[PDB]
């Protein structure tokens, strides 16, 4: 970072003047009356010249007009001629001008990004500042006059950044070019090449961007608008914000609008990335992306599944792209909305997942060794079928659980390597479908239909007919769930504990005998109540 | 959520974090604490010495005591023989107000949930 003044070279013309008082020779300012003698002081020299290194330098010259006060006017267009002789360097050069004088930037054209700062400036500043242009002036309207207060010849910019607050009027090279853009609106003209535009919230005039013919994409980043502020407007590029000043995207050329397809991306705060994807009879904005971490950092408070997110941009009115990711999170969850199919890819080993069907889509999984999958209880009717893909490495099986969807009736079904199940619970149901990676079931997959009763697929998958006909799995009815295996091979106490459950509301600890003579099982009741023992099916 | 493979040597200073009270459980039969919940890497840590932490008031059937927060661990022989299964087993041992250590794993995932 370079800090910059406004030196210049003086010579102080002098005098020997004698001081018959004190008997002494003293040096002394020329006598103005003596006709007309050389100036106390003269300016000889009003250059500055700094030539950066290898790395990244900032130049920020003194802010000479960072008003409109007539006393910083003054001073401004006093040191309007002044030169500022800048050479960057490959690591990149940014200049933040300083508000008065002759700037000559040569920005090296290896380095990655060159800004072009006007920030300094007053922030209710009108700007106009075009980047093909080699030589330019910035012109300050003062009372009944316009004075060139600033001159530059730059050579290698392509981060131009507006003033703070007002109304400019920026115009691209036909290089790849960055534009921060103010908050007071007003017009932007790209050039060619890659265009990417920061725009800041609550513009104080609507912002035209015209899209030049020769420009081939465009990256639009809103860091303080999220997408509630945005109004779904069809068949139209301009992003309408529903409270406040809009932006008025509009192209060169109406004939080719359809070019900027996919080559348009609007970024946002809170996560969506809109894109811009050709429809039958034109083009539209419909989110592609959905970083869900923005997302719960903007709401946190709302529910953060991928289907409650699709649901609730559905609500507002918003196509998808024919493929939707979902960025972040523990899973990389896909979206395909013609098929109406929700894929989750599975990365992590020994992965609780949590799976639930939803009336919009059909759910799968594609898992990986060790993990978990839990069924999610059904709560409404019309439940599309789900899909479970496992991944059987013979030495990490998963397990596929139904403890907590508690399960009344599950019957199961054989067809082309994958069971199909059905889960149905009191009044709803469910149908899911378990399949395998290499066209087989790993047939060390635990199903655990009940908290003590877990199967394994291998067994599960002999009592299936191999055509397709639904034989019982398992009923509510016969013996009632088993909290509690406990044998009568351990003799003497065992201090059973079964801990208090406030949902079930019900404990049943089953007592079993597998030896050949009567037991006789001496208990003592410690703590708890027992409603007596169980006998038949109702 | 994630473990490096040896990141945690024997002798390291370990201490608990900043919390409330970090429960510990004298029994895990059929308390029904040691078996595998959530995803990641299971720790199972065995602190040797436990006099000095205050009981909880406990329902008949459980044992759980409570720890101070800030209080020392000495790693004694990490094992991950079961590293493929993402099970690491972690002997401790307490110590006296020693004013060291990490309650974080090297990517910065909490320790003692």
Redesign the interface.
Known sequence: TIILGYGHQYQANTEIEYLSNWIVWREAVPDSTSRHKRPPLEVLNSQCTVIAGERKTTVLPLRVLSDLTPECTEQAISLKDYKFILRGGSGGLAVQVGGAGYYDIDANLVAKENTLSFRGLPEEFPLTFDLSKQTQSVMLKTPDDEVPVMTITQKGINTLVGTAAGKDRLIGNDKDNTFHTSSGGGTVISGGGNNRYIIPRDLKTPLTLTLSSNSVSHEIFLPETTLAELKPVAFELSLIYWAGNNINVQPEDEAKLNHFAGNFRVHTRDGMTLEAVSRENGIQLAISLCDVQRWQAVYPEENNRPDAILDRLHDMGWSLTPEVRFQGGETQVSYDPLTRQLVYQLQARYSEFQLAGSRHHTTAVTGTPGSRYIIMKPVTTQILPTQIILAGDNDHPETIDLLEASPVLVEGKKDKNSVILTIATIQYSLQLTISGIEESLPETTRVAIQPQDTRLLGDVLRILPDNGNWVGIFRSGHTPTVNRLENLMALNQVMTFLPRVSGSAEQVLCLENLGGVRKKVEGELLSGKLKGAWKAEG | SKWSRGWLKTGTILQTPEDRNTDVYLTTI???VFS??????QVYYRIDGMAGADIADN????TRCTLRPGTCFEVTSVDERHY???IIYVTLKTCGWSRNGQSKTPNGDNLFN
């Open positions: 059929q308390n029904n595998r919940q959530g995803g990641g890497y329902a008949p059937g459980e493929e299964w993402n």
